[PDB]
Design a protein around this ligand. Sequence first.
Ligand SMILES: CCN(c1nc(OC[C@@]23CCCN2C[C@H](F)C3)nc2c(F)c(-c3ccc(F)c4sc(N)c(C#N)c34)c(C(F)(F)F)cc12)[C@H]1CCN(C(=O)OC)C1
Ligand SMILES: Nc1nc2c(ncn2[C@@H]2O[C@H](COP(=O)(O)OP(=O)(O)O)[C@@H](O)[C@H]2O)c(=O)[nH]1
Ligand SMILES: [Mg+2]
Length: 170
Amino acid sequence: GMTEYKLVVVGADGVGKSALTIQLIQNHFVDEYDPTIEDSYRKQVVIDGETCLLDILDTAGQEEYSAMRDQYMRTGEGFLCVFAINNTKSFEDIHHYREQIKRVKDSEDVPMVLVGNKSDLPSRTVDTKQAQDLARSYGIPFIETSAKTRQGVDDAFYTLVREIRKHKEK
Ligand SMILES: CCN(c1nc(OC[C@@]23CCCN2C[C@H](F)C3)nc2c(F)c(-c3ccc(F)c4sc(N)c(C#N)c34)c(C(F)(F)F)cc12)[C@H]1CCN(C(=O)OC)C1
Ligand SMILES: Nc1nc2c(ncn2[C@@H]2O[C@H](COP(=O)(O)OP(=O)(O)O)[C@@H](O)[C@H]2O)c(=O)[nH]1
Ligand SMILES: [Mg+2]
């Protein structure tokens, strides 16, 4: 049947993980979505001619490392590591999220895409060049998005799917 891809959106509180997921599916920008709601969403799309089903986990809640939390994140096939272009701390927190993904997946190679969100704001504090070069050192794609305007939203999620299937052919 149809290929299902399990996507997990990770990143600091307030970078726009919920706003990105809601934009991808409903095509609307939500200004205040409950920071505490973690939920799975579903969308069927065509990526490079393949019809597939996305199973997107929009993460929220507390940092905790129980066995059950670990195993849950371990079911994810690829990860959107989201920072905000106006929050340097959310960008420097990226190393941490990638390290946790690598730990539970028990692999140095895990399908991932780096997402710099809020590209519509005029006062950035992380340069594209800086994030591009970090992304290049990880060997992963980098995409700047806006959940306000939709710029880059489809490309971010679709490129993660590409990374997963390029990792499956191994
Ligand atoms: C949404 C929950 N969350 C998370 N915060 C943090 O760290 C927050 C900071 C702030 C200083 C202390 N700490 C360390 C670092 F300095 C950054 N790390 C998280 C994290 F690593 C994951 C994770 C990812 C991939 C995986 F394979 C696994 S496996 C497993 N057991 C995970 C866990 N947990 C996990 C997740 C998860 F699961 F949802 F994806 C959520 C995390 C909130 C807490 C408040 N936040 C914030 O931004 O506060 C300003 C973000
Ligand atoms: N201007 C702008 N604001 C955004 C963008 N994405 C999210 N936001 C806002 O940032 C705040 C937190 O976003 P949210 O989706 O809840 O982030 P989350 O905690 O990672 O799920 C909210 O006020 C959103 O409306 C964006 O691309 N541009
Ligand atoms: Mg949220």
